[PDB]
Design a protein around this ligand. Structure first.
Ligand SMILES: Nc1ncnc2c1ncn2[C@@H]1O[C@H](COP(=O)(O)OP(=O)(O)OP(=O)(O)O)[C@@H](O)[C@H]1O
Ligand SMILES: [Mg+2]
Ligand SMILES: [Zn+2]
Lengths: 510, 313
């Protein structure tokens, strides 16, 4: 039983699950065992050995295969009846439009990143379908329901962004280990992956902190570890010493020579090796990486993945070599892996608890009792009132929300003479405001179009400063994302004295 | 010394409780009785966790309308022994674990049977068996756990004896601590006449008394309330409520007559919750890391409440 009226909706209602990881797997299992027969499952990744301690629908023999696919297959083994449709794809793909989402009576998120969760939040608001948002981290977890016009949305109260760093110190004055790691990850892209002006590895000779007066080379040398080494740990560090201003209060960097370096418990990864060892790791990882890149064809680019040994070896070694250069203690591969990949500890038990609460909230939703739904926090220790699981009532929509409000409007402060259309497109509209395919136009006479969703349309305006279009203090911009059916009015405030390494800022943010 | 494959496999949890804690888990053998809904979850959690070995004990056979409700048992097993019907899928969850099966009634096992396990988790057992296995475990320094699910409710209980563990609360300093649990017999027989008890009673979740009622129902009837005999079972449950609460000097009203509607059958979501908390406590106890809940855990799926109560002392 459920009873009738409930078991009915559960039996015919089509339900969507985004993500097939810790929560996803347990969710499918609980959905199926509770009575759900029509389930869509989407995930963009393949199974990995580290998934095996908590994603029970996957086994060692499934490694390398699609999470969504194998998940569907495993479930059918103890419930052959199940009507499951699996998608090995990103939920951000334009194919999953509002019409797609509107097909479901319930959507349940089981993701691990802000970008996709914000997108899903908007798709569900647009299709007006109930959305259960959930997350876990170590022993903690939470579950909440999101319903348009009734509760707050995922973005009604954004979460604190991750500590970002200025391309100045990462290139000229690193002080913390995390700085070297960031440097190593930039270095990876510059060499084997996508190139980005903000990820330059060479010493920035444009840093105001000290008065003044890569991909090409690397590939030409055939990715010679020795050549690459010398340039990044000898030449550049020495060329950095040119800016005498930089050092005079702190221990300056000490260059490293390939030949000189070569002349000198717990888990193996938890051990900190010596300089020579990390130089050998550097050389080794490059040899492997360059082969992978070559086997993908010309013009091919590699995408850094925390789970790839070589990719992780490169970052580990490059990072520790820079750390040493700056008199810092090096760190184990185990620790660098956590920082570089922003790895969140995970166990089966926490995910099982959350997936179970998720289905309980869904039953109330499909039962017409969304007013009995709530946010549930799973803590590690009982609170003063003896509660390990703390249920809190849902809050009504926040009129200040820049996403679910009737007429979204934000005011951005920036230098209209220094910010390009590309920065506006990538760092502000896409990254900051989480839009996937934006269409931005100026609110003027002819309705000037700055950015188009259609590939190859506004490619020319990309390097042009905003002012070149007549954008100035008081200007208003309308940003649209037709996929998310989201429209944001952007008020511009021209400011020249923003601050060090600050391209823009949202009036109101903390 | 764990292998390369295990390091890769447990990476995400080793980053959580450390390698040493994982090692103590790799040397622990657990006994689980009752491979129904709750038991199935706990089995999966511990096997994925990477215990040394796990012995699934159940003498009951898979009855009609049961396979498609137990993810460890294939739809084609109506009639086989639950434990054996679960072995294959359970073992595949982790080849590093020694998953064994036992088909004998738990109430006929000699104390020597329990001395091969570091922890014992009971499911679907009567009050007498729970008390019995707890007493046996105490004499042998065996960690004891019990839990069950009833409709939207669920509960777990632990008796770790004199349990010492390491808690990291600050570089991070690992402080050694010690908690003392009491016998399940004392936890199930609390005197509410005492002044100190009269004060605690008003802060105690009614789920404790709902547990008393269901335990007593499981004793008068070798079964738990069933949806097939709902009208009939509800009638008895209400009568048992009045007897139990009355024999404790507590008003029978403390438990709304409406409770009978929410404590029927085994709901998959509830098995997942209670099974996750129970397995979590077992891993904690075995790894001797982090403070274990002392000593009862009560879950109400209708309200979203997860409460920890200390009863018995
Ligand atoms: N845009 C997206 N579309 C579809 N699936 C996504 C998207 N983003 C993330 N996912 C999936 O969400 C799931 C999150 O699962 P979870 O965090 O529990 O495990 P994990 O990603 O495998 O863990 P780890 O990152 O530590 O290796 C992953 O399976 C991942 O591939
Ligand atoms: Mg992930
Ligand atoms: Zn909102």
């Amino acid at each position: 039983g459920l009873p009738r009226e409930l078991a009915e909706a559960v039996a015919g209602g089509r339900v969507l699950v985004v993500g097939a990881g810790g929560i996803g797997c347990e969710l499918l299992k609980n959905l199926v065992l509770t009575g759900f027969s029509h389930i869509d499952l989407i995930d963009l990744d393949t199974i990995d050995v580290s998934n095996l301690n908590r994603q029970f629908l996957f086994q060692k023999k499934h490694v390398g295969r699609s999470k969504a696919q194998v998940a569907k297959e495993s479930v059918l083994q103890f419930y052959p009846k199940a009507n499951i449709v699996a998608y090995h794809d990103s939920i951000m793909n334009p194919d999953y439009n509002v019409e797609f989402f509107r097909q479901f009576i319930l959507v349940m998120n089981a993701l691990d990143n802000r970008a996709a969760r914000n997108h899903v939040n908007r798709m569900c608001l647009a299709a007006d379908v109930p959305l259960i948002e959930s997350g876990t981290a170590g022993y903690l977890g939470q579950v909440t329901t999101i319903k348009k016009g009734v509760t707050e949305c995922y973005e009604c109260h954004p979460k604190p962004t991750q500590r970002t760093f200025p391309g100045a110190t990462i290139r000229n004055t690193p002080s913390e280990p995390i700085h070297c790691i960031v440097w190593a990850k930039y270095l990876f892209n510059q060499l084997f992956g996508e190139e980005d002006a903000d990820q330059e590895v060479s010493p920035d000779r444009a840093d105001p902190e000290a008065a003044w007066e890569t991909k090409e080379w690397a590939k030409s040398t055939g990715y010679d570890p020795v050549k690459l080494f010398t340039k990044l740990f000898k030449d550049d560090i020495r060329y950095l010493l040119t800016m005498d201003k930089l050092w005079r209060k702190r221990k300056p960097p000490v260059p490293l020579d390939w030949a000189e370096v070569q002349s000198q418990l717990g888990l193996k990864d938890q051990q900190v090796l010596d300089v020579k060892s990390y130089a050998r790791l550097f050389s080794k990882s490059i040899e492997t990486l360059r082969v992978h890149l070559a086997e993908k064809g010309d013009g091919a680019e590699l995408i850094w993945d925390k789970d790839d040994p070589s990719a992780m070896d490169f970052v580990t070694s490059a990072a520790n070599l820079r750390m040493h250069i700056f008199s810092m203690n090096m760190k184990s591969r185990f620790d660098i892996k956590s920082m570089a990949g922003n790895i969140i500890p995970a166990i089966a038990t926490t995910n099982a608890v959350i997936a179970g609460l998720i289905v309980l909230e869904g039953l109330k939703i499909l039962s017409g009792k969304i007013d009995q739904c709530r946010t549930i926090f799973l803590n590690k220790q009982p609170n003063p009132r003896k509660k390990l699981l703390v249920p809190c009532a849902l809050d009504p929509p926040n009129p200040n929300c820049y996403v679910c409000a009737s007429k979204p409007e934000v005011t951005v402060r920036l230098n209209v003479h220094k910010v390009t259309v590309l920065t506006l497109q990538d760092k502000i509209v896409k990254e900051k405001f989480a839009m996937v395919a934006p269409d931005v136009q100026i609110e003027d006479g002819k309705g000037t179009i700055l950015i188009s969703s259609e590939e190859g349309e506004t490619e020319a305006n990309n390097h042009k400063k905003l002012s070149e279009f007549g954008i100035r203090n008081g200007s208003r911009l309308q940003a649209d994302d037709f996929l998310q059916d989201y429209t944001l009015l952007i008020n511009i405030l021209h400011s020249e004295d923003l601050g060090k390494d600050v391209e823009f800022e949202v009036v109101g943010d903390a | 010394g764990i292998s390369e494959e295990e390091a890769a496999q447990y990476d995400r949890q080793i980053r959580l409780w450390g390698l040493e804690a994982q090692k103590r888990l790799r040397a622990s053998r657990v006994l689980l009785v009752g491979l129904k809904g709750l038991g199935a979850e706990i089995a999966k959690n511990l096997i994925l966790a990477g215990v040394k070995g796990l012995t699934m004990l159940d003498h009951e056979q898979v009855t009609p309308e049961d396979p498609g409700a137990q993810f460890l048992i294939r739809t084609g097993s109506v009639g086989r022994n639950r434990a054996e019907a679960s072995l294959e899928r359970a073992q595949n969850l982790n080849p590093m674990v020694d998953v064994k099966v036992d088909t004998e009634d738990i109430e006929k096992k000699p104390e020597s049977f329990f001395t091969q396990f570091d922890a014992v988790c009971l499911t679907c057992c009567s009050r007498d068996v729970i008390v019995k296995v707890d007493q046996i475990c105490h004499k042998n320094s065996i960690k004891f756990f019990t839990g069950d699910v009833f409709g939207y409710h669920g509960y777990t209980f632990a008796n770790l004896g004199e349990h010492e563990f390491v808690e990291e609360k600050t570089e991070t300093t690992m402080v050694k601590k010690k908690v003392v649990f009491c016998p399940v017999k004392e936890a199930l027989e609390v005197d509410w006449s005492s002044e100190k008890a009269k004060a605690a009673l008003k802060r105690t979740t009614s789920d404790y008394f709902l547990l008393q009622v269901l335990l007593k129902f499981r004793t008068d009837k070798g079964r738990d309330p069933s949806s097939d005999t709902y009208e009939e079972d509800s009638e008895l449950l209400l009568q048992i409520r009045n007897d139990v609460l009355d024999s404790l000097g507590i008003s029978p009203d403390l438990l709304p007559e409406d409770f009978v509607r929410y404590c029927f059958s085994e709901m998959a979501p509830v098995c997942a919750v209670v099974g996750g908390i129970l397995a979590q406590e077992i891993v904690k106890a075995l790894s001797q890391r982090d403070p274990p809940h002392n000593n009862f855990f009560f879950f109400d799926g209708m309200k979203g409440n997860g409460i920890v109560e200390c009863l018995g002392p």
